[model samples]
Target: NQSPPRFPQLMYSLEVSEAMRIGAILLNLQATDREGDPITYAIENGDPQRVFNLSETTGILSLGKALDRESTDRYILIVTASDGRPDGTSTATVNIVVTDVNDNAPVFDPYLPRNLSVVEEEANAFVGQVRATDPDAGINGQVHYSLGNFNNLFRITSNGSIYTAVKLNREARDHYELVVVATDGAVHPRHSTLTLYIKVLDIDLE
Candidate 1:
C-alpha cells in the first residue's frame, strides 16, 4: 500500500571462519535496519537443501550439514526483515566466505597387539579391539568404524569395536589379515587406517 515502507533501508554483511572441525565453518552476520526494533532476519536463499539455517529471532546462523568446499566455495543469502507492519519490509544480501580447518588427524593404538589367537570352539572369543580418536568436538566427534580392503573375515561396530563375523577354523585358515578404517562425520573428515592380524588355534579333543 505505501511502497512497502521504502523497504526499511538496511545494510548487512556475512562472514565465515575456519571451525575447530574440518568441513565446517563458523557463520556470523552483521545487520542494521533503519527503523530498528522488531527487525528480524533469516536466511532465505542459498542451498535449497538447507546447508545454512538462521534463527529468525536470534539472528544466529548454524550449519545444517557438512560443507563441500570443492563443490561449492561460497554462498549467497537473501535476508528479509519485517517490522510487523503490513507495508514494512526490508531485505539485504549476505555473502558468506567459507574457510577451512584441519581438525582431524589419523589415530591408532599401536600398543595393542595387532594379531590375536583364538579357538573355534570358544563361544565368545575376544578378538583384538582397535582404538582411535577424533580431534574434533560435537558432531565431528562421531566416528564410523568400517573394515577396509578386507572381505567378510570380520566386522566392526559403530564405535570402532571389531569382532569376528563368522567361525574361524585353524585347518581352513590358520591366520587372517584385516584392514580397519575410521572416519569422522565432520564436514572435513579425518580418516585413519589400521591392520589386524588373527591366528586360529586348534582345540584339544578329549
Candidate 2:
C-alpha cells in the first residue's frame, strides 16, 4: 500500500480581528490531496462545533460568531481532508489568532451602587461608585466615565467613582436621577450606562 494522502502544509495560520462583526468572512484554506480523489473538509478534532464551519467539498471556512480576544485569543483547529475511505486522509493544524479591536462595549458592573444618599456637605462631595468592564484587550479595554444628562449635578472618574459636582441640599431638590456611562476609547467608541436614583439628606454639619 502507498503512503496515506498527505497535505502540502502541516500548519496554517489565520487571524480574525475583533472588530469584524458576526457573519464576516475571515479567510480561506486549501489543501492538496496527492491521490486526486475528491476531498471532503471538516474541523474534526478541535474547536467547538459552533466556532467555525468548513465546507465538505470546497474546504471553505468562515466565522460562525462574534469573537472576543480577551476571553480567548487563539484557536487551534484540526482540519481533516478525507477521501471516501478513512485511510486516505490528510490532516492539517489551523491556527486562528484573534486581534484586538473595538468590538466590545464597556458594561457597568451589575452591583454598582445605584440608590444613594448624600449629606449637606461642601461642593464636590463623594457620592457613590459605579464600575464597568470591557471585554477587549489593550486600548480597547480602557474605559472612560461620563454622566450623561446628569452631568449638571454629578460627575465620574476614570476609576468609575461617581461624585457630586455641587453641594447637596435637600431643601432645594430632594430627589435626583443620575445617568452614568462607561466608554472605551475607540474610534467609534462603545459604551453602556447606569442609572442611579439618589436623595439628598439633611444631616448634621458636625
Candidate 3:
C-alpha cells in the first residue's frame, strides 16, 4: 500500500514502576505499511542510549537496566518505523511516566563543622543553631537533630538550637568539639553527621 504507516495514536504513553529490572517490556508498538513492504522499528531518540531499547523487528520496548525515579521520572522516546525505502520513514513519540517508589533515602547538606560561641561565665546562655537540609519529599525528608557525644556542657533543642546546659569556664575547658547528627523520619532512618565546636571565651573580654 502507498499510504504511510498509520499509528494507533498520535502520542503513545506508558507507565513503568520505578527501579524495574532489566529486560522488562514497556509496551509493543504497531504500525502498518500499506505498501506491503517489510517494516522495521527502531528507537530514534530520547533514551540517551541507556536503560531502554526497542526491537528492530518486533516493536517491543524494553528496559536495558534498572530505573530510579528519584533522579529522573520522565522519558521521551522517538521511534521510527521504516519500510527500507526512501520515503518509508515515519516517527512517533512515546512518553514514559515513572511511578514513585520510596527507595531513596533523605540527604543532608552543609555536612561539615559548625561553630558556636559563648562567654565563659554565663550559664544557660544561648549558643547557636544547627543547619541541616534533606532532599527527599514529604515524610521521607522530615529531619531531626541530636547530639552524639558531648561533655555534658551543652544541649540541643528540637529545633536544632545548641545552648549551655551548664556554666561555661574557659579555665575548665576552652573549647569542645561535639558530634552532631541529623536524621530523617524514614522508616529506616538515614542520618548525616557534623561537628559542633563550642568556644568558651573569657567573660571579662570586653
Candidate 4:
C-alpha cells in the first residue's frame, strides 16, 4: 500500500501585515508524497472569519479579507494535504501572525472641543490635558500631542499636558483659539485635531 503524504514540519509560522490587501499570498504548505501523486491542500479549520483562501493544487495560502491586528493578532489554521485519496491525507498546523500597521488615525478621547479659563496675570499655569486613542500596537498606537497654532503663551507636552509657556494678560488678548493635534508614531503617521478655547479672566482686587 502506498503511504500517505507526510508534512515535513508539523508547525509552520508566517507573518502577514495588517495592511495587507485581499488576495495577498501568505505562505505555501508543502508535503512529501513518496508516490509522486498529485497533491491537493485544504484548510480544515481555525478560520472562523473566512479570512484566508488556500489553493487546492499548489498549497498556497492567500488573504481573503483585510486583516486587523487589534481585533485578531494570531490565527492557527489546520491544513490538510492529500494525494487523491482520503487514506493518503495528512494535517499540519499553520500559525499566521498578524503584524500591526498604522492604518487607524488617532482619535480624541472625548471627541469634542474643550474650554479652559486662566487668570489674566497667571504665568506658567496648568491649562488642561488632551489625549487621543489609537487602536494599533507598539509605535503605531503611541499618540503624541502638538499645537497647530504655535503660541508663545501656551505649550503642549508630548504626553498631552497643556501648560502656559508665558504670562497671560486679558488686556492684550482675552480669548485664544488653539488647534490641538494628536499624531501617532508611525512612518506615515495619522493625526487628528481638536479646538481648544482658552479664555482669560480678570482678577478681582481684595
The local distance difference test score of model 4 is 0.87
Q: Model 3: per-residue lDDT, tens digit, 49-164?
A: 47788888878888987887777789999888888766778889999988755455434456543777898877778888876776665666778888898748778877777788
Tally clashing residue pairs in candidate 2. 0
Candidate 1, residues 65-169: lDDT per residue as tens digits? 766543455787787756667657667676776654546655776787787776774534667677777655555757778888544657678766666667777
In Å, residue 61's CA in model 2 sits off its true spot by 3.4
Candidate 3, clashing residue pairs?
1-34, 1-35
Selected candidate, larger lDDT, 2 vs 4: 4
The models' CA-based lDDT, in order, is 0.65, 0.78, 0.78, 0.87
Q: lDDT of model 4 at residue 186?
A: 89
TM-scores of the candidates in the order shown: 0.48, 0.74, 0.74, 0.87
**In model 4, what lDDT does residue 156 have?**
90
Stretches of candidate 1 off by over 4 Å are 1-16, 19-102, 121-124
Q: How far is candidate 2 from the true structure (C-alpha RMSD, Å)?
A: 3.6
Error of 2 at 59 (Å): 3.9
Residue lDDT tens for model 4, 16-66: 888898988888787878978888889999998899999888888899998
Error of 3 at 35 (Å): 6.4
Which candidate has the top score in lDDT? 4
Off by over 4 Å in 3: 33-37, 68-71, 99-113, 121-124, 150-160, 165-174
Candidate with more favorable, higher lDDT: 3 or 4: 4
